[PDB]
Design an enzyme around this catalytic site. Structure first.
Site, mmCIF file in Angstrom:
data_model
loop_
_atom_site.group_PDB
_atom_site.id
_atom_site.type_symbol
_atom_site.label_atom_id
_atom_site.label_comp_id
_atom_site.label_asym_id
_atom_site.label_seq_id
_atom_site.Cartn_x
_atom_site.Cartn_y
_atom_site.Cartn_z
ATOM 1 N N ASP A 25 0.829 -1.203 0.000
ATOM 2 C CA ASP A 25 0.000 0.000 0.000
ATOM 3 C C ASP A 25 0.867 1.258 0.000
ATOM 4 O O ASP A 25 1.339 1.695 1.053
ATOM 5 C CB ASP A 25 -0.931 -0.010 1.206
ATOM 6 C CG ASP A 25 -1.972 1.073 1.134
ATOM 7 O OD1 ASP A 25 -1.898 1.898 0.200
ATOM 8 O OD2 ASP A 25 -2.867 1.092 2.000
ATOM 9 N N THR A 26 1.031 1.866 -1.179
ATOM 10 C CA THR A 26 1.779 3.113 -1.293
ATOM 11 C C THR A 26 1.067 4.284 -0.626
ATOM 12 O O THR A 26 1.695 5.323 -0.394
ATOM 13 C CB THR A 26 2.034 3.435 -2.768
ATOM 14 O OG1 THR A 26 0.787 3.578 -3.460
ATOM 15 C CG2 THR A 26 2.857 2.329 -3.419
ATOM 16 N N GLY A 27 -0.220 4.146 -0.314
ATOM 17 C CA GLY A 27 -0.955 5.191 0.368
ATOM 18 C C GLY A 27 -0.856 5.164 1.875
ATOM 19 O O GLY A 27 -1.386 6.060 2.536
#
Ligand code: 017
Lengths: 99, 99
Positions: A25-27
């Site tokens: 998850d880059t967020g």
């Protein structure tokens, strides 16, 4: 490897002698895992997203293996609906976004 | 481009003729933007994140350019903590995870 995003980027991880499925998850600033009974001390924390905040337990210098890539850093533990590998560990395995 | 994850993967987007900053979020199925005025019809929908569910307005077939890459897809508008670009649009611009 290369992971396309047609479906959720779920991968197998290894933490505290256990195998789990987790989202790359880059967020997510920091890794957060579903409730689990890790040993050691911890610090209370609250993290927020869509819907509001949840309370989590912050463990430091936890070893996690993501797709056979070893990492060590902060792991949050709490009532998250899904295991999330965040940037604090994605950097350590050499993960990038590419388009 | 190749984007590392030591900092938040924030990029400039253009939607409804307006420039905005948004987070490339591989852990989001859908794209959710903060409150804004978008033309065309919309349907009310519900979406859930780490902290629960929020009410959003669903706009379909919206043109949105992400870091110089055009996409046409569904955009949800509501009280998200930050503009997030989800997989429905990341796929359209050819974004993959690589490590
Ligand atoms: C909203 C982001 C800035 C932050 N989030 C990461 C994000 O990827 C979550 C991660 C996520 C994923 C599934 C369930 C809960 C949270 N995805 C999300 O909210 O997406 C929603 C829009 O598309 C839908 O698809 C998933 C849920 C919906 S977060 O889960 O709340 C979060 C916040 C802080 C940390 N340290 C770790 C995670």
């Amino acid at each position: 490897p290369q992971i396309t995003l047609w479906k959720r980027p779920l991968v197998t991880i290894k933490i505290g002698g256990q195998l789990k499925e987790a989202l790359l998850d880059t967020g997510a600033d920091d890794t957060v895992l579903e409730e689990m009974n890790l040993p050691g001390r911890w610090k209370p924390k609250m993290i927020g997203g869509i819907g509001g905040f949840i309370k989590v337990r912050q463990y430091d210098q936890i070893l996690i293996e993501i797709c056979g890539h070893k990492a060590i850093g902060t792991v949050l533990v709490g009532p998250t609906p899904i295991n999330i590998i965040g940037r604090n560990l994605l950097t350590q395995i050499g993960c990038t976004l590419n388009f």
